[PDB]
Design a protein around this ligand. Sequence first.
Ligand SMILES: CCCCCCCC/C=C/CCCCCCCC(=O)O[C@@H](COC(=O)CCCCCCCCCCCCCCC)COP(=O)([O-])OCC[N+](C)(C)C
Ligand SMILES: CCCCCCCC/C=C/CCCCCCCC(=O)O[C@@H](COC(=O)CCCCCCCCCCCCCCC)COP(=O)([O-])OCC[N+](C)(C)C
Ligand SMILES: CCCCCCCC/C=C/CCCCCCCC(=O)O[C@@H](COC(=O)CCCCCCCCCCCCCCC)COP(=O)([O-])OCC[N+](C)(C)C
Ligand SMILES: CCCCCCCC/C=C/CCCCCCCC(=O)O[C@@H](COC(=O)CCCCCCCCCCCCCCC)COP(=O)([O-])OCC[N+](C)(C)C
Ligand SMILES: CCCCCCCC/C=C/CCCCCCCC(=O)O[C@@H](COC(=O)CCCCCCCCCCCCCCC)COP(=O)([O-])OCC[N+](C)(C)C
Ligand SMILES: CCCCCCCC/C=C\CCCCCCCC(=O)O[C@@H](COC(=O)CCCCCCCCCCCCCCC)COP(=O)([O-])OCC[N+](C)(C)C
Ligand SMILES: CCCCCCCC/C=C\CCCCCCCC(=O)O[C@@H](COC(=O)CCCCCCCCCCCCCCC)COP(=O)([O-])OCC[N+](C)(C)C
Ligand SMILES: CCCCCCCC/C=C\CCCCCCCC(=O)O[C@@H](COC(=O)CCCCCCCCCCCCCCC)COP(=O)([O-])OCC[N+](C)(C)C
Ligand SMILES: CCCCCCCC/C=C\CCCCCCCC(=O)O[C@@H](COC(=O)CCCCCCCCCCCCCCC)COP(=O)([O-])OCC[N+](C)(C)C
Ligand SMILES: CCCCCCCC/C=C\CCCCCCCC(=O)O[C@@H](COC(=O)CCCCCCCCCCCCCCC)COP(=O)([O-])OCC[N+](C)(C)C
Ligand SMILES: CCCCCCCC/C=C\CCCCCCCC(=O)O[C@@H](COC(=O)CCCCCCCCCCCCCCC)COP(=O)([O-])OCC[N+](C)(C)C
Ligand SMILES: C[C@@H]1CC[C@@]2(OC1)O[C@H]1C[C@H]3[C@@H]4CC=C5C[C@@H](OCCC(CO)CO)CC[C@]5(C)[C@H]4CC[C@]3(C)[C@H]1[C@@H]2C
Ligand SMILES: Oc1ccc2c3c1O[C@H]1c4oc5ccccc5c4C[C@@]4(O)[C@@H](C2)N(CC2CC2)CC[C@]314
Lengths: 1107, 183
Amino acid sequence: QKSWIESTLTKRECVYIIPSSKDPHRCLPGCQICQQLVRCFCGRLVKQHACFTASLAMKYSDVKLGEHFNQAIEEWSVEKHTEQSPTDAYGVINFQGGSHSYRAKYVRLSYDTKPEIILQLLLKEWQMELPKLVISVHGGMQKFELHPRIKQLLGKGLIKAAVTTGAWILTGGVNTGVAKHVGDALKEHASRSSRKICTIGIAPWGVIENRNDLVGRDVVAPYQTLLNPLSKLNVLNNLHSHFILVDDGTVGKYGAEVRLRRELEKTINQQRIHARIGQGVPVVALIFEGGPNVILTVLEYLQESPPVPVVVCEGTGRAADLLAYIHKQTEEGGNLPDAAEPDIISTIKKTFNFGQSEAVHLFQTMMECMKKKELITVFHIGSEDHQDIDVAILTALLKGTNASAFDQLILTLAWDRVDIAKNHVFVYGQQWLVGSLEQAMLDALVMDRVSFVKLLIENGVSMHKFLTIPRLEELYNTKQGPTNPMLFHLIRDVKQGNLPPGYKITLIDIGLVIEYLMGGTYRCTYTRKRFRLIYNSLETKRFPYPLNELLIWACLMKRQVMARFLWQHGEESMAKALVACKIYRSMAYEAKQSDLVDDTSEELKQYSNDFGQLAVELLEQSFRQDETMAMKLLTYELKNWSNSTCLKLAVSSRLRPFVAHTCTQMLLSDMWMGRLNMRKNSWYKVILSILVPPAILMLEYKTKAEMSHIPQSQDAHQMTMEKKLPITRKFYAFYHAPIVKFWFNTLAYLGFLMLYTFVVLVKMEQLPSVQEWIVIAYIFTYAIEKVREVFMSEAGKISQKIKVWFSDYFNVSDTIAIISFFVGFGLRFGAKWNYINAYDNHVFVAGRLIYCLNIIFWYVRLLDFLAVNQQAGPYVMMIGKMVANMFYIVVIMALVLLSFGVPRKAILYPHEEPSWSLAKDIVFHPYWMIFGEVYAYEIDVCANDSTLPTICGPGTWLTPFLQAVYLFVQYIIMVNLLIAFFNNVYLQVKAISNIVWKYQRYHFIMAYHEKPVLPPPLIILSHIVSLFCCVCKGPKLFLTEEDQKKLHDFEEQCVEMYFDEKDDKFNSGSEERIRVTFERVEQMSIQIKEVGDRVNYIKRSLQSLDS
Amino acid sequence: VINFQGGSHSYRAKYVRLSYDTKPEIILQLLLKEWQMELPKLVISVHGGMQKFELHPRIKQLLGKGLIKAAVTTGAWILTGGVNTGVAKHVGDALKEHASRSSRKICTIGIAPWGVIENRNDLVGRDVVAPYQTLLNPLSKLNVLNNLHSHFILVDDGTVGKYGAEVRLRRELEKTINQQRIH
Ligand SMILES: CCCCCCCC/C=C/CCCCCCCC(=O)O[C@@H](COC(=O)CCCCCCCCCCCCCCC)COP(=O)([O-])OCC[N+](C)(C)C
Ligand SMILES: CCCCCCCC/C=C/CCCCCCCC(=O)O[C@@H](COC(=O)CCCCCCCCCCCCCCC)COP(=O)([O-])OCC[N+](C)(C)C
Ligand SMILES: CCCCCCCC/C=C/CCCCCCCC(=O)O[C@@H](COC(=O)CCCCCCCCCCCCCCC)COP(=O)([O-])OCC[N+](C)(C)C
Ligand SMILES: CCCCCCCC/C=C/CCCCCCCC(=O)O[C@@H](COC(=O)CCCCCCCCCCCCCCC)COP(=O)([O-])OCC[N+](C)(C)C
Ligand SMILES: CCCCCCCC/C=C/CCCCCCCC(=O)O[C@@H](COC(=O)CCCCCCCCCCCCCCC)COP(=O)([O-])OCC[N+](C)(C)C
Ligand SMILES: CCCCCCCC/C=C\CCCCCCCC(=O)O[C@@H](COC(=O)CCCCCCCCCCCCCCC)COP(=O)([O-])OCC[N+](C)(C)C
Ligand SMILES: CCCCCCCC/C=C\CCCCCCCC(=O)O[C@@H](COC(=O)CCCCCCCCCCCCCCC)COP(=O)([O-])OCC[N+](C)(C)C
Ligand SMILES: CCCCCCCC/C=C\CCCCCCCC(=O)O[C@@H](COC(=O)CCCCCCCCCCCCCCC)COP(=O)([O-])OCC[N+](C)(C)C
Ligand SMILES: CCCCCCCC/C=C\CCCCCCCC(=O)O[C@@H](COC(=O)CCCCCCCCCCCCCCC)COP(=O)([O-])OCC[N+](C)(C)C
Ligand SMILES: CCCCCCCC/C=C\CCCCCCCC(=O)O[C@@H](COC(=O)CCCCCCCCCCCCCCC)COP(=O)([O-])OCC[N+](C)(C)C
Ligand SMILES: CCCCCCCC/C=C\CCCCCCCC(=O)O[C@@H](COC(=O)CCCCCCCCCCCCCCC)COP(=O)([O-])OCC[N+](C)(C)C
Ligand SMILES: C[C@@H]1CC[C@@]2(OC1)O[C@H]1C[C@H]3[C@@H]4CC=C5C[C@@H](OCCC(CO)CO)CC[C@]5(C)[C@H]4CC[C@]3(C)[C@H]1[C@@H]2C
Ligand SMILES: Oc1ccc2c3c1O[C@H]1c4oc5ccccc5c4C[C@@]4(O)[C@@H](C2)N(CC2CC2)CC[C@]314
C-alpha cells in the first residue's frame, strides 16, 4: 500500500462506550442529556466516537444496557475494549516560521508497540543517525522561570554536550515545563546544529492541542504556536525535530508514554555505539525543576541493571533543589547526619502539601537517592564548579557504573572529546592494563581520531612496540573509517586484474603500489627479499621506522590531517615531505585517467602542494642556518626511501620551487665548476686552457674540504682521497669538469658552423670538399651521441626513455636536423653527375637545397648554447612562451590579411584562369604591408606615376580605399594590440621563465656528468672505449660516519627551529593578539560583574555590623 | 644513548654506569671533554623527598617557570635524582611546559643508582643506542628514569635495592665544579 507505517504502526479507538460515573448534569428530560454531556469512560463524549460498528447501536439508546452489575463498570481496559486500526497520521508538522522554517516529524503510535519496532522506526524510516549519547531531560510541568544568569549556563551546557557528541535529547515534547527551557537553549545557540542535534519529544496524543488538524496520511500539516487565552492545554515546542505520540484513552489521561519512553532507553543502550566498540550507547538523565512523580523516576533509574546515572541541577528550585540539598549534607554511603528529619520533611512539604503522613513516604525515596551518590552529579552554580555541565554530563557517565579505564577511554574516543579524556581519564593514579592503550591506538588510527593519537603517544604509547605487521595489515583493511575509494583501483593495476571478492590486502601488494606511484627505479621495503621471507614466517615482526610506514598509509588512504600529524614525528622530515608530494601527485594523475563519478584529483593536487610547500620551507630554514650543510641535505642517500635523494625526489615530483630555490642553485653552480675554483678563475682562463693544455696547471683548484658538499663519481672520489694535487691529477680534474666539457663542445660547435656555413655559401663540386667531410663526420658522430643519451639515461623501460626525450624542444629539432641532413647528403652524394653543367641534375639541387635549409636548425641551436647564461636563458625560454600566447592575435591578423588580398586581386586582375598563382597573389603583397612596404606606386593604378598602368580598368578605384582600411586595422589596431599584449603579460611570463630556466639546470648539469670528455668530431674515440670496457667487464655524496652524525643533528635542529618560529610568528601577530585580548576581556567582564555582585553581597553586612 | 620512546619529540640522553670510588678529577674529566658539554655558570642541585607527590596547579606554574628562566638565562646544570620518583617528575614537567628547545642551554644531569632502576640489563652494551620505555608498570614498584634529562650518572655499591651510593659522589661532584673558574 506504499506505506511502511500502515503495515507496522497502530492507531486505536475506544469502540466500546462505557458512560461516566453516575450523574448527568441538569435538564430534567433525561432522554436527551445522556447523549449531550455524559462522557465515555474512554474520556471523550458519545457524539465523537462515530463507531462504524456501534453507530447502529447508539440509535437504540446507547451501547450496553443499563445498571451493569457495579463490579463490571470498571471493566474498560485499553487491552480489552479499545480496538486497533491502521495509520491515521504521519507527515511533517512544520511550525509557523519564526526565526527560520523549523520542520519536524510525527508518528502517532500506540502503547503496545514492541521495543524492536520503535527502534526500527527512528533509524531506518526517518533517516536518523544512530546516536552516541541520550540525554533524557526530566522535570516538572508548568512550574516556570529560571533566572537570566542560570539560563545561559544551563542553556550553553546542554548544547555543547549534544553537538560535540551527536546526541539525542529526549524531552516531554509538549511546551509545558522542561521542553520550553530545552528549546530556548536551542534558540540562543543554534548555529544550524540541528543536523547534529536531534531532540525527540515523546508527548501523548492527549493534552496536545490541534490533534485533529494532524489527521492525515503523508500530510505536511501546518501548526500554529499562538498562546490560546481561554485554553489551558499544551502545544508542541517549535524547536524539536521528531515527535512520538502515544494514546491510551484520549485527551486528558496524562500518562501513557512513561513506560514507552523508558523502554526506548533500553533499546538504545543495547545497541553498539560503533562497529569497533563493544560498549553500548550510554544514557544520562538531566534533572531540571522537578516534581512528585520525578522522584519515582530518578529512583527507578538507579535501581536497574545497567544503572543509568542521573545529573541533577540546582538554582531552579523544586525537587531538583531537594536532590541538591539532600545530597549535600551527606558524606559517603551511610544513613544520615545528626537527626534533622523535622527539617527535611518540613522542606519536602513546602514544595507540595503532603503533611507529615506521605511526606514521610517521600523520605524513603530521598534516603535511597542519597545512597548512590556516585551516580548523582550535582552542579553547583556560583563557584564555576566542574566547568560547563557538558563536562559534567559526560563525566557522570565515567564515575559510576564501575568499568575499566579502557572502557572510560574508548567511550571518549567515540565522542571525539580529548579534553574529557585528558583531564578525567588521564588523571594521576589511574592504572592501565598491558595491552589496553595499544588497543586504544589501533581504534584511534582507524577512526581518524588524530588528537587521541597525540594524547596516547604523550601518555606512554610507543609506536615502535605498537606497530606490528599484522596490525598494519589491518590499518589498510578497514571500511570502518574514512576510506580511499582509489586504493583498490591502484592494487588491481599492479596485480594484472585478478580480484577475489573478499581480498584482504597484503603489504606485498601495497609495495607494488608505492613502486608504481614513485616511478623509475624505486624499490619499496615491502617487495624485497628480506621482507618476503619474514612475511612467510608469520622483535623482527616489528618495524625499525614505524612513522615512515604510517605516513605512507595516511597518504594512500587520503587522510591528510593524519598525515600532517605523522609527518612532524620522526626523522627525515624534509625527505618524507617530498615523498608525500610525489605519492599524492601520482594519485592525482591516476584520478584523471580513471572512470569514477568522484574525481577527487583537485583534492590530491592540493595535498601534493601542501607537502611540497613544507619541503621548501624546511630548505629555506636549513639554508639560513648553514649554507654548506643545507647543500649536503639535498644529496645524501636516505637509506629508507630506496637510496634516493631529496633532489631526485623533488625533480621526480616536478616541484619547481625546490629546484629553483637558491640552495639547489648554489649546488648546481658548484657541480658545474667541478674541481675548478671558478671564484678566483675566469672564463678567459678556461677557454685558454682548452687550446693550451699546459695552461691547465696554472689554474687554482678546490681542496678536499672545499668539496665535502658536492657529489662525485666513485673514481673521482679516489682522486680526492689522496697546493696539493700532483700533475696527472690536475688533468683529470680539468677535462671532467662540466664547465670544461661545455666550452670544449661549444668551441667545436662554433667551428662546425663556420665550416658548414662555408660549405653552403661556396660552390659545390661533385665530390665533397675537406670542409664538407668534417661536417658529415660531426653530424654522424653527433648523432651517435644522441642515440647514447636515449638508451643510457634513467628509466628501465625502453619506450619510456623515448617519451621523455622527445618532450624537449631542441631534442626534437635535432632529430629533424640529423635525419634531414642525411636525406640531403644522400641526394647530394648518391647522384649521377652531369659533367657539363652543375644544377642540371635536379637530384643534386634538391640535396644542396636541403643543406641550405638544414643549416637553420644549427644556428637556432646556438640559442640552446646561449641559454646557459643567467640573463640570456630566461629570454630564450620566454620567446617560446610568447609565441604560444599570441597565437590567436596572429590568427586574427591573418584573417584581416585574407579579407584584403582576395578583393584586391579580384578587382585588379579580372581575367585570370585558375592557377596556384592565385593563392600566392592574395597573400603575398598584403603580408609585406605589415612590415613597412606600402607599395606606394601600385596604389591607384590609374594614376600617372603608377608602375602598373596596364592594370587600370573598370573599378580599380576601390583598392586605395580597401588598403587604407587594411593598414588602419593592421598597424593602428592589431600591431598596437600586440604591443599592449606583450607589455601586460611580460612580468608573469618573465617570472615563469625564470623558474623554468632554474628548474631545468638540473637536467642540464647532471647530463654533463655523464657526457664524455671529448667533443662530437672526436667523440668516436670515446664510444670505442665505452664499448670496450662494458663488454669485457650517477654521482654520490660521500660522508664519513662522524659527518652523517653531524648532518642528522643539523636536520633535526633545523626542523625544531622551523616549528618554533612558526608558532612564535603566529602568537606574535596582531591578528592573534587582538583575539586573545578579546577572549580575556570577555572573561574579565564576566568576573568583575560577578565580583561586583559579591561586593554588593558585602554591603548587606555593612548595614548589619554598623548597627 | 638512552633514547626515550618519543612523546612530544625525540629526547635523547646519555649514561655511563660508573663505580663509587671514582676519583673527583676523573668524574670532572668525564662531563666536559667526552660528552662535549659546556662548563656551566650555575649548578642548581634540587633536593626533596621521593614518591610523595602532587603539587597544586597554581604552584606548579610558578615553580616550573622559575626553574627554567634561572637555567636558560645563566646556562646552568640542574642536578636531580634522575629516577622518576619524587623531585625529577616535577623538574621534568617544568621542562615539558616551557621547553622552547632550550635543552641546548639546559643540561639536567640525573645522578641515580644502578639499583632501583628498571630495565638495567637492557642498558647493557658497549656503544649502544638502546631504546627505553616509559610505561608505568602496574605490578612493579621500582622507578624509571625521567624522559626530559640529558645525562645520567649511575653508581652501584651492591645491587638492585641498597638505596644509597650516590649521596657522596653527587656531593663530591659539587666540590669539583666550585673549584673550577667560571670564566
Ligand atoms: C632541411 C629542411 C627540411 C625540414 C624543414 C622544416 C622543419 C619544420 C619545423 C619544425 C619545428 C622543429 C621544432 C619542433 C618543436 C616541437 C615541440 C615539442 O617538442 O612538442 C612536444 C612533442 O612531443 C612528443 O611527444 C613528440 C614525439 C615525436 C617528435 C615530434 C616531431 C614533430 C615534427 C614537427 C613537424 C614538422 C616537421 C616537418 C619537416 C620534416 C613536446 O612534448 P609536450 O608537448 O611537452 O608533451 C609531451 C608529453 N606527452 C607525450 C604525454 C604528450
Ligand atoms: C636519437 C634520435 C636522433 C638520431 C638520429 C640518427 C639517425 C639518422 C638517420 C638517417 C637516415 C636518413 C635517410 C638516409 C638517406 C636515404 C634517402 C635518400 O634520399 O637517399 C638517396 C641516396 O641513396 C643512396 O643510396 C645514397 C646514400 C648514401 C649514404 C647516406 C645516407 C645514410 C646515412 C645515414 C647516417 C645516419 C646515422 C647516424 C648515427 C646513428 C636516394 O636517392 P639518390 O640515390 O640520391 O637518387 C637516385 C637517382 N639518381 C642516381 C639518378 C640521382
Ligand atoms: C605566434 C604563433 C602564430 C604564428 C604561426 C606559427 C604557430 C606556432 C605555434 C603556435 C602554438 C599554438 C597555440 C595554441 C593553439 C593550439 C592549436 C590550435 O590551433 O588550437 C586552436 C584551434 O585553432 C583555431 O581555432 C584557429 C586555427 C587557425 C590557425 C591558422 C594559423 C594562422 C596564423 C599563421 C601566421 C600568419 C601570419 C600573418 C599575420 C602576421 C584551439 O586551441 P586548442 O587546440 O583548444 O588549444 C589552445 C590551448 N589549450 C590547450 C589550453 C586548449
Ligand atoms: C593562407 C592561405 C594560403 C593559400 C593556401 C593554398 C596553398 C596551395 C599551395 C600549392 C603549392 C603547389 C602548387 C605549385 C606546384 C609546384 C610548381 C611551382 O609552382 O613551382 C614554383 C615554386 O613553387 C613551388 O615549387 C611550390 C611551393 C610549395 C609551397 C607552398 C606552401 C603551401 C602550404 C603552406 C606551407 C608553409 C610552411 C609552413 C606550414 C606549417 C617554381 O616556379 P616559379 O616560382 O613560378 O618560378 C618560375 C621560374 N622558374 C621556372 C625558374 C622556377
Ligand atoms: C605555420 C604557420 C601558418 C602560416 C599561415 C599560412 C602561410 C601562407 C601560405 C601560403 C601558401 C603558399 C602560397 C603559394 C602557392 C603556390 C605558388 C605557386 O604554385 O606558384 C608561385 C611560386 O611562388 C612561390 O612558391 C612563392 C609563394 C609566395 C611566398 C609566400 C610567403 C608567405 C607570406 C604569407 C605568410 C602569412 C600568411 C597569412 C595567412 C593568411 C608562382 O606561380 P607559378 O604558377 O608557379 O608561376 C608563375 C610564374 N611567374 C612567377 C614568373 C609569374
Ligand atoms: C667539426 C668541428 C671542428 C672543430 C673546429 C676546428 C677544426 C677545423 C679546422 C680546419 C679545417 C679546414 C679544412 C681543411 C682544408 C683546408 C683548406 C681551406 O680551408 O682552404 C680555404 C681556406 O679556408 C680556411 O682557412 C677556413 C675555411 C673554413 C671557414 C672557417 C674556418 C675556421 C673553422 C675552424 C676553427 C674556428 C673555431 C672557432 C671557435 C673557436 C680556401 O678555400 P678552398 O678550400 O681552396 O676553396 C673552397 C672550395 N671547395 C669547398 C669547393 C673545395
Ligand atoms: C662514401 C660515403 C661514406 C659514408 C658517408 C656517411 C657518413 C659516414 C660517417 C662519417 C663521415 C665520413 C668520415 C670522414 C672521412 C671522409 C672520407 C673521405 O672521403 O675523405 C676524403 C678526404 O677527407 C679528408 O681529407 C678529411 C675527412 C674527414 C675529416 C674529419 C674527421 C676527423 C675527426 C675524427 C673523426 C673521424 C671520422 C668520423 C667517422 C664517423 C678522402 O677521400 P678520397 O676519395 O680519397 O678523396 C676525396 C675526394 N677526391 C678524390 C676528389 C680527393
Ligand atoms: C624519416 C626521413 C624520411 C626521408 C625520406 C627520403 C626522401 C627521398 C625522396 C626522393 C628520392 C629522390 C631520388 C630520385 C627519385 C626519382 C626522380 C629522379 O630520379 O630524378 C628527379 C628528381 O626529382 C626530385 O624532386 C628529387 C628530390 C626529391 C626529394 C625532395 C626532398 C625530400 C626530403 C625533405 C627533407 C627531409 C625531411 C625529413 C625529416 C624527418 C629529376 O632528376 P633526374 O631524373 O636525376 O634528372 C634531371 C631531370 N630530368 C629527368 C628531366 C633530366
Ligand atoms: C680559438 C678561440 C677560442 C675563443 C673564441 C670563442 C669564445 C667562446 C665562444 C663564444 C662566445 C662566448 C664568450 C663569452 C663567454 C662568457 C662566460 C659566461 O659567463 O658564459 C655564460 C654563457 O655561456 C655561453 O656559452 C653562452 C653562449 C656562447 C657560446 C655559444 C655561442 C652563442 C652566442 C654567440 C653567437 C654569435 C653572436 C652574434 C654575433 C656574431 C655562462 O656563465 P654565466 O651564466 O654568465 O655565469 C658565469 C659563471 N659560469 C661561467 C661559471 C657559468
Ligand atoms: C609562411 C610564412 C610564415 C609567416 C610567419 C609565421 C610563422 C613563423 C612563426 C614562428 C617561428 C618561430 C618558431 C619558434 C616558436 C616556438 C614556440 C614554442 O612552443 O617554443 C617552445 C620552445 O621553443 C623555443 O624556445 C624557441 C627557441 C628557438 C627560436 C625559434 C626560431 C626562430 C629563429 C629562426 C628564424 C630565422 C628566420 C629565417 C629562417 C627561415 C616553448 O613552448 P611553450 O609554449 O613555452 O610550452 C611550455 C614549455 N614546454 C615546451 C616545455 C612544454
Ligand atoms: C558610399 C560612401 C560615400 C561616398 C560618396 C561618393 C561616392 C558614391 C558611391 C559609389 C560610387 C560608385 C560609382 C563610381 C564610379 C564612377 C567612375 C567609374 O566609371 O568607375 C569605374 C566603374 O565603376 C562602376 O561601374 C561602379 C561599380 C559599383 C560600385 C559598387 C559600390 C562601391 C562602394 C561600396 C558601397 C558604398 C558604401 C561603402 C561603405 C562606406 C570605371 O569603369 P568604367 O566606367 O568602365 O570606366 C572605363 C574603363 N576603361 C577605360 C578601362 C574601359
Ligand atoms: C577560408 C579561406 C578562404 C580562402 C582560401 O583559404 C581558406 O580558400 C582556399 C581555396 C583555394 C583555391 C582552391 C583550389 C584552386 C584550384 C587550383 O586549380 C589548379 C589550376 C592549375 C594550376 O596551374 C592547373 O594546371 C588553383 C588554385 C585554387 C583556385 C585555390 C586558390 C587559393 C584558395 C582560394 C585558398 C584561399 C587562401
Ligand atoms: O634550464 C636550462 C638551462 C640551460 C640549457 C637548458 C635548460 O633547459 C633546456 C632548455 O629548455 C628550453 C626551452 C625553451 C628554450 C630553450 C631551452 C633549453 C636550452 C637547453 O636545451 C640547453 C641549455 N642545453 C643544451 C645546450 C648545450 C647547452 C640542454 C638543456 C636546456
